[PDB]
Design a protein around this ligand. Structure first.
Ligand code: ATP
Ligand code: ATP
Ligand code: MG
Ligand code: MG
Lengths: 403, 413, 889, 51
């Protein structure tokens, strides 16, 4: 089936104007109108169409034959058409009889098999055994951001778009030459320079089944559970239709391997080895594309960054001049700036000013405004923020050593 | 001098600003947010309780016949037999994890049909013996066979002829032509471990062998070799080799054996204890007072220096094979192989890109052939050009993503 | 809690209210002095927006509330000396002191009267002093009065004055973003007299700055897609924009005509007093507009033909809708501009994957249905192209490997091949028309009628080309003649031709299917009154046996004869038509739903949509009589298919969730044409991939499968998109492979998918105007109700050719001389910028700037940069004419 | 109760023998991280914190 389960989101086609206006009022009213229409119709048609001759007496029979508290067990070497061996959670090998309700196909060794509580008997198949610690990594409420929200990263955004969106948007463009679409881009750069922002942007216009990881939640405390959570993650990814898995902060399980002496620093190594094996090893990999974000690309073990497993290493740098003004424009819009607080000045000066710094200056600026009892930011309210947000930073060479 | 904010101050602040229709906007947004919840609640996740074959294909039997299946045919429990007292009908069995017992043989089964070591179908209540069970073939162990033919031939594995010949001398000829090894009586070397920098085709050649193995090519998923409960790994490896010694000419590949193998030590938590035990079982099986037979082992690693000595020494792995970076001819052939399916202009000189990609590996050669027509797709052409490929090389390798030496740096002329 | 320094404010403004009660005793002038001082302080504090929490107001509201409440009426003395300033100083603390319970005194506190020069507060303040609160209050009061007591007291005049002053002064108080708020005020207020309120407002405000009018036009344009369920606002928002597009803006008037076209193309009201009254746009965009006006000639050639003095060369010029030479420029550009115009093989795209021949290694088949599908693709994919023909070069024997219906469809395909060929098609047609074959002549008549529905040529080779066979009483020939005439004269409204053909319907001579096809053709002809045909249809419905209709299958075509005539029309006559159609069996309810749907094409509402959606499925699934509950949903697209491309993403949700997952298992679960109609623009794996696949392999219902596959084809009318192909060819096997009907219908249209250089979208150039003739797609969709012997089993397989009244995609560039223009432009994706403080670029980046003529996809954008002699209309409607301008001086 | 309330990672008290769901036993895990919700409120008001 390989269901291409989307983020089950986008219930907000997005209100076009963000300035409080009757246009906004009318559009959101239309949204509510269709939502109420849907609710009404579904309820009404549930109540109507008197199919009360339901339950399909026969399905009632099946439920009757499969008693209460059915148990979850692992099927094992299947012996005969009408007979098979099962292994309960205590690891006890009962010898049950496969009843007729079970489709003889779909029951392969290692597939979780339902059972009758009293007389162990394979009653039905279960095709949803995803580790409850892995299903919690499927994004089902798409983060609210768009490529326009991010700014100043054209070249660094087109690269991700050419390996997370276009390959499934116009795949003819790629086959026409036969080059296999690039798979896996590592977004490395200094702290507070995007990275996660671009990740959420690509999550928004997904068209796929985004899986989110943490970079530390993979590590597990039971020998082997580590290098099986990753296996389950990518099994789910390949079972579901085209997907992109963002293994954020891969600096955690990525340290350069070494002849260690501890045990934890060997289990983590085994986890990285599982990651490498599956991402590019004897196997394949369908339409599964991996996005990795890190703060230090020099620490990642050469292997998890190779031009067959992670191509298109993006180099998100500290924002440049024009990008700074762009980001200020994008992050100062929804504020009632005065007529003398043009941002064309706060740029420059310090050569160290990241996007996080920009948003901090823009927020502790409105907060500063709410101190003279005003709702229109002021140039003093901005010049008093550089001395309160950007501080504690380190410095450089002593003047005189060079010019 | 920062006086706080008073309640009246907040109240006035909330109402002096442009909100002609803004209270309504917030209210409607809240209504939408509270309406989504109702909609999904009433259309919740259903129709997911699968596992039911369509009681239409066998609909007729999908009935009281099932109950007839139930009730009779008591569900048995598996168990082994550790003895069978001769001329004394008593048997002794060890079920599995519960306990041992002494059992009587049910009348329905003749004693001759039941032997020592076979799996019996002991019943509940009074543990009597019934229809014997055939020997187990574990699911994890049996889910390892290649059972396919990966789409990679030897031809596509370019840039290394000596390496391929070395591998073939142990993986193919010693099984597909024993004659050459008898006239001289040379014992076919067994155990080939492939080194190499990260990414050079070490796994490509392993895959290529699978396309002509004409036998089993069990692929050790090292991650599976380690499990929570102690002894699980040792049993896993023992079953691996026992199924190995059941066919003709079985080859077992241990991809990234660094995971299971490592220098032993008792300092940190007594080492890995369990992992080291699994490694020791593997070493004993490979070499010991129990000749293996007709099973060969191929293993690959990025760093052989971190392998336990009792496994790097000959005997366990004889034919070590460096997989060094390709030579000029190797690079040219590699480019040609990973360019034969590309819409490239005919006048492209691939002998030049090879020089312009020094100290690169096969994965880099790929990432250059690709991301080469990617610039063409960016330009919206259809036949990439030599300029495109050269720009790709300059943007992939040599300078890759970081070129510090540039500002007035021309000292190498 | 004592606040130093600031303690004075809660002091003196506290004593002054203490002196309010006393007054005449011991302080006669005290009253005047205190009021003057306090008014001065409040004005001073609130005028300058150096702060947004008003100090004096914050101090006063707490105590002075009761004092002023008991002092406004306590004095009771009606003079400006105290009363006027008292009322003013009490009104000011309304917005910030009065809570929600201010619906009763909302006006009484201040609206009783305007003290002195109450515009004074409105002078120094930039935008916010009170005027926004005042506007909100006035709108609320108007709503309150109009709810039940619209005939209000003498308050009419005062509010009119305040509204005029605010709209004329505060709106542009500093040229700020306040402009966006004036439309809000003038709309929520003076809904009926919005024309006059606007006249007062724009008497001076628009003219003082002709520049501001662009923002007004922008917001009204973006709003037109949103308005009341009844199109009185939408009609209102259509009259009002004409003056704004007038000399109050550039004399190009292109946008003026666009909006005037929006309101059901109200020719008489707006455009019928402009073409003969301007006569000064000849070197201006009038010519480009008329060439761009492929929507209406019955009112253009009926005027210029009678005049014969507006242009010295009536025969020359596009003469409005002579756009036939569209074929000229189309062929020229595709041949030269499109360097890739080769013949298209078929088997190549059929067996692209050699893995399909494994095992069998042959077993060639030449089944009739496969032959029919190949003939259908061969007739379509070369539309307007009579030069590429691989399998049609041997037509003498090709047209025979198919039944009579297949070969008739082949004739229709051949006719369409030479689409829009006034005379060039005759060379090919005659050679098979002179065949003495009933069905050959039938198909030829179909094709001749088709090929004459894009010009309205002076030679009119429809009425004089197929009327002779019209009266003949032979089923096939009469059907062909009637269908061809109806197609050719669909867009045009030739009443004489309508009347001449009508006796075919009104006479029992024609077969029942003949009457149905005649109704279809007349409806395509009609977008106005067609009262004769409506009377004929109603008579037919009266004199149509209950058993006749019950067994009637290829007979439900009639409701078109009421829809296409009254496309996009309001209740005034729609209710009468619905009532008059209440004279039949549940099939009368059928026709009711169909007629309402055919009326409201894109007029997104909630009243009719909700009522039909509810009743149709709540009244017909329970009893044996059913099959209505499908058409409502299957027509939600109509009246909703054009929600400014906004409600489409909601209609998708409702449809997919309901009409399939929890919809009716059999009948209603045919809500597959829904999406197909909604979005024929090609979608990458977002809203059509899963919804269409998850139903494609649903062998549970063959009708489901066929309909959803046809939708799959429709979703890519002319994008030639390839990702669809991953199914349009991967369907063979792993699901439906050779299930005769399924195996055919899949390809039959999935290879209609890659139609080149064409467009089937229903919106006009600006992405928001509908085509009256463009609705003809309703024919190939309702006629696709089941396809079970309707299309799927060839019973009338000629609509599939009927719907090919289709616009192109090209983006030309020439100026009334020739295609001497090969300039550079950068179309890209379109991102609207309705509200922005600065002229930010509409799109994030320049994108593509292909020099060649733009085969503009769905959301394209503006032309090349550098002000390289930019045009005048500035609409980019696929026919723009670039005008010379001062560039590179 | 009706499934609606019960969500993944939601402890539920099941009946004995029958094993039919009974209550949404709130008790949402928290082994020892559940020892950090300060309950005995400390004793320090800005009156003493000077400067
Ligand atoms: N160029 C930029 N344009 C717009 N917003 C930016 C830009 N750079 C940073 N930001 C903002 O900075 C904020 C901080 O989060 P962000 O996603 O940028 O961090 P990051 O780079 O992922 O950090 P980390 O190094 O911790 O992973 C975000 O909300 C993001 O919108
Ligand atoms: N000499 C070569 N000739 C042709 N292709 C090569 C060569 N070396 C590497 N490649 C290509 O490199 C690609 C990536 O190799 P892959 O990472 O799967 O294996 P590996 O080089 O053995 O590395 P790893 O250490 O990760 O196992 C393969 O698909 C293969 O086609
Ligand atoms: Mg994430
Ligand atoms: Mg490898």
């Amino acid at each position: 089936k390989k269901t291409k389960g989307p983020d089950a989101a986008s219930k907000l086609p997005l209100v076009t104007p963000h300035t409080q206006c009757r246009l906004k009022l009318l559009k959101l009213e239309r949204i509510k109108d269709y939502l109420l229409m849907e609710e009404e119709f579904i309820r009404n048609q549930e109540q109507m169409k008197p199919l009360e001759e339901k339950q399909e007496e026969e399905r009632s029979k099946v439920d009757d034959l499969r008693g209460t508290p059915m148990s979850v067990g692992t099927l094992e070497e299947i012996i005969d058409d009408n007979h098979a061996i099962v292994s309960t959670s205590v690891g006890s090998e009962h010898y049950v009889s496969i009843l007729s309700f079970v489709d003889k196909d779909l029951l392969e060794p290692g597939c979780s098999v339902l059972l009758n509580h009293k007389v162990h008997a394979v009653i039905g198949v279960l095709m949803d055994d995803t580790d409850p610690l892995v299903t919690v990594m499927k994004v089902e409420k798409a983060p609210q951001e768009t490529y326009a929200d991010i700014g100043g990263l054209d070249n660094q955004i087109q690269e991700i778009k050419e390996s997370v969106e276009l390959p499934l948007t116009h795949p003819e463009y790629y086959e026409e030459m036969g080059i296999k679409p690039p798979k896996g881009v590592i977004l490395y750069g200094p702290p507070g320079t995007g990275k996660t922002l671009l990740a959420k942007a690509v999550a928004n216009q997904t068209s796929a089944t985004f899986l989110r990881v943490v970079g530390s939640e993979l590590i597990q405390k039971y020998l082997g559970d580590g290098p099986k959570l990753v296996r389950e993650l990518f099994r789910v990814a390949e079972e579901h239709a085209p997907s992109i898995v963002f293994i954020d902060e891969i600096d955690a399980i990525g340290t350069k391997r070494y002849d260690s002496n501890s045990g934890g620093e060997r289990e983590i190594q085994r986890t990285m080895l599982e990651l490498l094996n599956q991402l590019d090893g004897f196997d394949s990999r369908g339409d599964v594309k991996v996005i990795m974000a890190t703060n230090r690309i020099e620490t990642l073990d050469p292997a998890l960054i190779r031009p067959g497993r992670i191509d298109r290493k993006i180099e998100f740098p500290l924002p440049d001049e024009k990008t700074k003004k762009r980001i200020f424009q994008i992050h100062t819009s929804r504020m009632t700036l005065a007529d003398d607080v043009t941002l064309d000045d706060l740029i420059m000066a310090k050569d160290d000013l990241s996007g996080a710094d920009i948003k901090a200056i823009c927020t502790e600026a409105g907060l500063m405004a709410l101190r003279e009892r005003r709702m229109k930011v002021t140039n003093e309210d901005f010049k008093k923020s550089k001395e309160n947000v950007l501080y504690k930073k380190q410095e450089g060479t002593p003047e005189g050593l060079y010019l | 001098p920062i006086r706080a904010l008073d309640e009246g101050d907040i109240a006035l602040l909330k109402t002096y600003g442009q909100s002609t229709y803004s209270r309504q906007i917030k209210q409607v947004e809240d209504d939408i947010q509270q309406l989504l919840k109702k909609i999904n609640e009433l259309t919740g996740i259903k129709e997911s309780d699968t596992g039911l074959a369509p009681p239409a294909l066998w609909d007729l039997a999908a009935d009281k016949q099932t109950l007839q299946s139930e009730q009779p045919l008591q569900v048995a429990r598996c168990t082994k037999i550790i003895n069978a007292d001769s001329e004394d009908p008593k048997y002794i069995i060890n079920v599995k994890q519960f306990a041992k017992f002494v059992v009587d043989l049910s009348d329905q089964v003749a004693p001759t049909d039941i032997e020592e070591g076979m799996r019996v179908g002991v019943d509940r209540n009074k543990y009597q013996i019934h229809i014997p069970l055939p020997p187990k073939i574990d699911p994890t162990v049996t889910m390892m066979q290649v059972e396919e033919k990966p789409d990679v031939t030897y031809s596509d594995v370019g840039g290394c002829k000596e390496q391929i010949e070395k591998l073939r001398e142990v993986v193919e000829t010693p099984l597909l032509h024993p004659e050459r090894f008898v006239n001289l009586g040379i014992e076919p070397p067994k155990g080939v471990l492939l080194f190499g920098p990260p990414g050079t085709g070490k796994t490509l050649c392993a895959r290529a062998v699978a396309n002509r193995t004409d036998a089993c090519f069990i692929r050790v998923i090292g991650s599976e070799l380690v499990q929570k409960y102690v002894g699980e790994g040792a049993r896993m490896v023992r079953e691996l080799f026992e199924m190995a010694r059941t066919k003709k000419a079985c080859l077992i590949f241990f991809d990234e054996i660094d995971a299971i193998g490592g220098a032993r030590f008792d300092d940190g938590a007594g080492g890995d204890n369990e992992v080291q035990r699994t490694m020791l079982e593997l070493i004993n099986q490979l070499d010991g007072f129990d000749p293996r037979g007709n099973i060969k082992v191929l293993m690959a690693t990025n760093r052989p220096d971190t392998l336990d000595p009792a496994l790097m020494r000959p005997g366990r792995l004889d034919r070590k094979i460096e997989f060094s970076l390709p030579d000029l001819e190797g690079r040219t052939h590699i480019f040609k192989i990973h360019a034969r399916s590309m819409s490239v202009e005919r006048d492209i000189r691939f002998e030049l890109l090879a020089r312009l990609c020094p100290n690169s590996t096969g994965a880099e050669i790929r990432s250059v052939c690709t991301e080469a027509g990617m610039f063409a797709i960016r330009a919206r052409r259809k036949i990439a050009t030599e300029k495109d490929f050269l720009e790709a090389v300059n943007k992939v390798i040599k300078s890759y993503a970081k070129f510090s030496a540039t500002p007035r740096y021309m000292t190498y002329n | 809690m004592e606040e130093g320094g600031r303690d004075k404010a809660p002091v003196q403004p506290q004593q002054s209210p203490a002196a309010a009660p006393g007054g005449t005793d011991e302080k006669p002038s005290g009253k005047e002095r205190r009021d003057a001082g306090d008014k001065d302080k409040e004005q001073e504090l609130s005028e300058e927006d150096k702060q947004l929490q008003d100090e004096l107001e914050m101090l006063v509201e707490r105590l002075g509330e009761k004092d002023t409440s008991l002092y406004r009426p306590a004095l009771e003395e009606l003079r400006r000396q105290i009363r006027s300033s008292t009322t003013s100083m009490t009104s000011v603390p309304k917005p910030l002191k009065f809570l929600r319970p201010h619906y009763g005194k909302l006006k009484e506190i201040y609206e009783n009267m305007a003290p002195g020069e109450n515009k004074r507060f409105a002078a120094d303040i930039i935008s916010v002093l009170a005027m926004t609160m005042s506007g909100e209050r006035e709108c609320l009061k108007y709503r309150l009065v109009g709810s039940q007591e619209e005939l209000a007291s003498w308050g009419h005049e005062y509010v009119r004055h305040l509204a005029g002053e605010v709209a004329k002064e505060w709106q542009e108080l500093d040229d700020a973003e306040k402009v966006q708020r004036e439309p809000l005020l003038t709309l929520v207020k003076e809904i009926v007299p919005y024309n006059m309120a606007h006249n007062a407002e724009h008497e001076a405000c628009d003219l003082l700055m002709e520049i501001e009018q662009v923002d007004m036009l922008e917001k009204d344009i973006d709003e037109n897609a949103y308005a009341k369920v009844c199109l009185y606002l939408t009609s209102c928002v259509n009259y009002v924009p004409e003056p704004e597009n007038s000399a109050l803006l550039r004399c190009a008037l292109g946008v003026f005509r666009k909006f005037s076209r929006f309101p059901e193309a109200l020719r008489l009201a707006l455009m019928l007093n402009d073409m003969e009254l301007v006569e000064d746009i000849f070197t201006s965009c009038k010519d480009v507009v008329v060439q761009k006006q492929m929507a209406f000639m019955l009112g253009r050639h009926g005027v210029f033909l009678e005049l014969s003095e507006d242009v010295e060369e009536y025969e020359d010029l596009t003469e409005i809708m002579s756009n036939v030479q569209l074929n000229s420029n189309f062929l020229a550009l595709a041949r030269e501009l499109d360097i890739m115009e080769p013949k298209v093989p078929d088997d190549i795209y059929k067996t692209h994957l050699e893995n399909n021949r494994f095992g069998g290694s042959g077993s060639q088949v030449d089944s009739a249905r496969m032959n029919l599908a190949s003939s259908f693709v061969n007739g379509f994919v070369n539309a307007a192209f009579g030069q590429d023909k691989l399998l049609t070069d041997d037509g003498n024997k090709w047209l025979y490997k198919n039944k009579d219906h297949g070969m008739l469809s082949a004739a229709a395909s051949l006719g369409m091949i030479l689409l829009w060929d006034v005379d060039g098609g005759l060379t090919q047609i005659d050679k098979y028309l002179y065949s003495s074959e009933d069905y050959i002549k039938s198909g030829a008549l179909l094709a001749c009628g088709i090929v004459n529905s894009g010009v309205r040529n002076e030679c009119d080779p429809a009425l004089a080309l197929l009327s002779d066979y019209v009266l003949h009483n032979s089923n096939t020939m009469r059907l062909g003649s009637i269908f061809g005439l109806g197609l050719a004269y669909a867009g045009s409204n030739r009443e004489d031709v309508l009347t001449l053909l009508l006796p075919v319907m009104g006479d029992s001579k024609s077969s029942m299917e003949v009457a149905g096809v005649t109704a279809l053709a007349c409806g395509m002809i009609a977008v106005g009154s067609c009262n004769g045909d409506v009377t004929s249809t109603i008579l037919q419905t009266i004199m149509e046996k209950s058993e006749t209709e019950l067994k009637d299958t290829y007979a439900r075509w009639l409701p078109l004869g009421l829809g296409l005539n009254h496309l996009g029309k309001g209740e005034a006559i729609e209710a009468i038509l619905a009532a008059l159609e209440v004279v039949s069996e549940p099939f009368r309810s059928f026709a009711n739903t169909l007629v309402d749907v055919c009326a409201y094409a894109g007029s997104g509402n909630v009243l009719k949509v909700q009522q039909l959606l509810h009743i149709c499925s709540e009244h017909f699934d329970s009893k044996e009589k059913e099959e209505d509950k499908d058409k409502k949903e299957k027509k939600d697209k109509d009246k909703k298919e054009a929600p400014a491309d906004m409600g489409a993403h909601q209609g998708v949700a409702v449809l997919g969730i309901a009409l399939i997952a929890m919809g009716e298992e059999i009948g209603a679960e045919m809500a597959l044409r829904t999406f197909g109609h909604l979005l024929r623009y090609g979608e990458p794996t977002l809203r059509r991939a899963v919804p269409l696949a998850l139903a494609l392999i649903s062998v549970s219902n063959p009708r489901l499968n066929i309909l959803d596959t046809l939708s799959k084809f429709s979703h890519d009318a002319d994008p030639e998109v390839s990702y669809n192909s991953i199914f349009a060819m991967g369907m063979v096997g792993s699901g439906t492979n050779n299930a005769r009907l399924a195996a055919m219908l899949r390809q039959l249209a999935q290879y209609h998918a890659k139609d080149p250089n064409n467009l089937f979208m229903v919106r006009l150039a600006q992405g928001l105007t509908h085509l009256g003739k463009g609705t003809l797609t309703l024919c190939p969709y309702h006629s696709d109700r089941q396809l079970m012997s309707q299309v799927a089993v060839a019973g009338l397989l000629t609509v599939l050719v009927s719907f090919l009244d289709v616009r192109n995609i090209i983006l030309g560039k020439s100026h009334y001389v020739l295609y001497g223009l090969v300039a550079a432009m950068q179309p890209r994706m379109l991102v609207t910028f309705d509200e922005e403080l600065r002229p930010l670029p509409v799109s994030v980046r320049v994108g593509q700037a292909v020099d060649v003529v733009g085969q503009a996809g769905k959301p394209k954008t503006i032309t090349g940069f550098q002000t390289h002699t930019t045009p005048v209309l500035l609409a980019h409607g696929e026919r723009a004419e670039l005008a010379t301008e001062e560039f590179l001086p | 109760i009706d499934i609606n309330d019960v969500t993944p990672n939601c402890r539920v008290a099941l009946r004995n023998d029958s094993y039919t769901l009974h209550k949404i036993l709130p008790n949402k895990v928290d082994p020892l991280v559940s020892l950090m919700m300060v309950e005995k409120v400390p004793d320090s008001t800005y009156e003493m914190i000077g400067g």
